[PDB]
């Protein structure tokens, strides 16, 4: 099992995008996904002010700058991987479709409709 | 005679003859939302009271005589004081703290009755 | 005891004592429309079931014993299996294909009864 970094594509896809402190970061995760089988790791990041959200074209936003220095601490709770595919498999970071980030929290829930009427045989008569 | 809530200052037994008077009074898109919310709520409030009468076995009635005994701890008064001196507004305050107990008992006695009536058929 | 749908995994005769538990749980303008539609639908669904009980002669009841015979072709089981082994979810699947037949028969027998009762007055 090998891990490899992302394939090409736009910045929003090939990097780890997130919003923290009010600014939009695009970090290079090739330092995390570079191994066969299994101090600190420093990931360099780029920052943008002009943001095209989701996959839409036509509605851009400008992110006002934030004064002072930004520091964020967060939990990585999971990964989105895509398999590149005969004795080995390569996994690469994937993403870009936001539904995958909600599917991971809503996986336990189901919506059902209640149907309160029913009939059954009984031994009685009006 | 009197119109809506006209009997509000009357005694409980003088009132309770006017039950249909009150029962019949219960029935720019943003402006439109406000009006629809008001109408939908009036319907939902109406239906909740009707559902509750239904589970107590009082559906379709304005006066429903039940099979739950009165506990003197809820209000130790004789019929003369309750029906001839007090008004419904005063009464509602007097037994406010026992309303949920009474409602629970009414539901239970109906469930027992409803099953007994099935066994007899 | 149990709350809403707590009896869902219980047998049919263990359940059906909890009928009031489930019955009571049936009750930016664009955001407002979504919420009003949800509320209006809950009311419409409620009323359709109530209308249907009404035309079958079961208004106001949670358990209504009717005058339509059970056809063994709908489900050839004894009371012991239906009420002591099966759950309501299993039963609903078993006779799904006969629901509309049964409903039609219930309407017809009420129409006959309702007229007989007029002729006797």
């Amino acid at each position, epitope marked *: 099992i090998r891990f490899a970094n992302s394939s090409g594509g736009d910045l929003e896809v090939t990097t780890h995008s997130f919003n923290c402190g009010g600014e939009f970061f695009y970090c290079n995760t090739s330092g995390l996904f570079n191994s066969t089988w299994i101090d600190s790791i420093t990931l360099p990041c780029r920052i943008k002010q002009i943001i095209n959200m989701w996959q839409r074209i036509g509605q851009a936003m400008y992110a006002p700058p934030i004064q002072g220095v930004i520091r964020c601490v967060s939990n990585i709770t999971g990964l989105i991987l895509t398999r590149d595919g005969s004795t080995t498999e390569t996994f690469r970071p994937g993403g870009g479709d936001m539904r995958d980030n909600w599917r991971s929290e809503l996986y336990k829930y189901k919506v059902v409709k209640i149907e309160p009427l029913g009939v059954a045989p*009984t*031994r009685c008569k009006r | 005679f009197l119109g809506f809530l006209g009997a509000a200052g009357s005694t409980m037994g003088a009132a309770s003859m006017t039950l249909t008077v009150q029962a019949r009074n219960l029935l720019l898109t943003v402006w439109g939302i406000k009006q629809l919310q008001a109408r939908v709520l009036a319907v939902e409030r109406y239906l909740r009271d009707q559902q509750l009468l239904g589970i107590w076995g009082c559906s379709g009635k304005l006066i429903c005589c039940t099979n739950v005994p009165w506990n003197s701890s809820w209000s130790n008064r004789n019929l003369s004081e309750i029906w001839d001196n007090m008004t419904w507004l005063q009464w509602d305050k007097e037994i406010s703290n026992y309303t949920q107990i009474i409602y629970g008992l009414l539901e239970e006695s109906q469930n*027992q009755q409803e099953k*007994n009536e099935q*066994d007899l*058929l | 005891f149990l709350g809403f749908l707590g009896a869902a995994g219980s047998t049919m*005769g263990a359940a059906s004592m909890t009928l009031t538990v489930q019955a009571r749980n049936l009750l930016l303008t664009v955001w407002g429309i979504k919420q009003l539609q949800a509320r209006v639908l809950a009311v419409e669904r409620y009323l359709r079931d109530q209308q249907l009980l009404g035309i079958w002669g079961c208004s106001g009841k949670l358990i209504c014993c009717t005058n339509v015979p059970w056809n063994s072709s709908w489900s050839n089981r004894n*009371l012991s299996e239906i009420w002591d082994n099966m759950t309501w979810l299993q039963w609903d699947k078993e006779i799904s294909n006969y629901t509309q037949i049964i409903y039609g028969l219930l309407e017809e027998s009420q129409n006959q009864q309702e007229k007989n009762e007029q002729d006797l007055l």
Partner: antibody
Framework: EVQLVETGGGLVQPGGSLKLSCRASGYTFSSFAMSWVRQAPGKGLEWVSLINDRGGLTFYVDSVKGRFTISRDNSKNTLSLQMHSLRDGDTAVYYC??????????????????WGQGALVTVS | ALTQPPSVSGSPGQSVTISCTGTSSDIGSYNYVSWYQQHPGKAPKLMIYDVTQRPSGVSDRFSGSKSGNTASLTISGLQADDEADYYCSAYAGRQTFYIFGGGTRLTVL
């Protein structure tokens, strides 16, 4: 194996009162309707009273209808029969029996499945 | 109530029939006619229920049926231990729930 054990006094004066009871075991008490049947000292059987499994419905033979009360306590597995007034005509062996009715969601009985041994009651 | 006051008899191996006669708004219309066996000094035992059915534990020497307003109990391979008073009963509707006939003494010869 089931048991029905009648207990209770066996000798009263007419005009008095008497309580009989029946302790049950070996079956779910609460699943069955129960009844009392008299055996006249020199004749046959007579049905006296019937109670529902839940204890809410009671039925009586006309001759005791205004005098006897049948009751059930499902937490202790017991029946009771409270006699009042008492007549010489009430002398009999009183049997505790399981059966008699039904509960709508189950097969009917309309027969008596189990009998106790019988308490003897004499009215002097 | 129901009737059959005389005794009944036969030798071991001979069958016997015990009658139980009622009326229309009783035994005729309701198919609930059980039979009970009582040895003197002992509690009654259920032998037949409904019309033809027997309890588990009851031998196949005991069977029964009804016609019109008359019911009967049949005992086939009669044994010495069948000497008991047999009673019939019936469900007679609501209000009058149960009635019994007098018992009949079965004598094995």
């Amino acid at each position: 194996e089931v048991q029905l054990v009648e207990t209770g006094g066996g000798l009263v004066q007419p005009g008095g009162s008497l309580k009989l009871s029946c302790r049950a075991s070996g079956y779910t008490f609460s699943s069955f309707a129960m009844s009392w049947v008299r055996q006249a000292p020199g004749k046959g059987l007579e049905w006296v009273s019937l109670i529902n499994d839940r204890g809410g419905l009671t039925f009586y033979v006309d001759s005791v209808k205004g005098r006897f009360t049948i009751s059930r306590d499902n937490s202790k597995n017991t029946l009771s029969l409270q006699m009042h007034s008492l007549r010489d005509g009430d002398t009999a062996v009183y049997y505790c029996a399981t059966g008699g009715m039904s509960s709508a969601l189950q097969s009917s009985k309309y027969y008596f499945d189990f009998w106790g041994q019988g308490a003897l009651v004499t009215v002097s | 109530a129901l009737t059959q006051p005389p005794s009944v008899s036969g030798s071991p191996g001979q069958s016997v029939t015990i009658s139980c006669t009622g009326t229309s708004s009783d035994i005729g219309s309701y198919n609930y006619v059980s039979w009970y066996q009582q040895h003197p000094g002992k509690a009654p035992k259920l032998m037949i229920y409904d019309v033809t059915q027997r309890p588990s534990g009851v031998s196949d020497r005991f069977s029964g049926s009804k016609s019109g307003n008359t019911a009967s109990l049949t005992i086939s391979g009669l044994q010495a231990d069948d000497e008991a008073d047999y009673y019939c009963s019936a469900y007679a509707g609501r209000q009058t729930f149960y009635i019994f006939g007098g018992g009949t003494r079965l004598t094995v010869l």
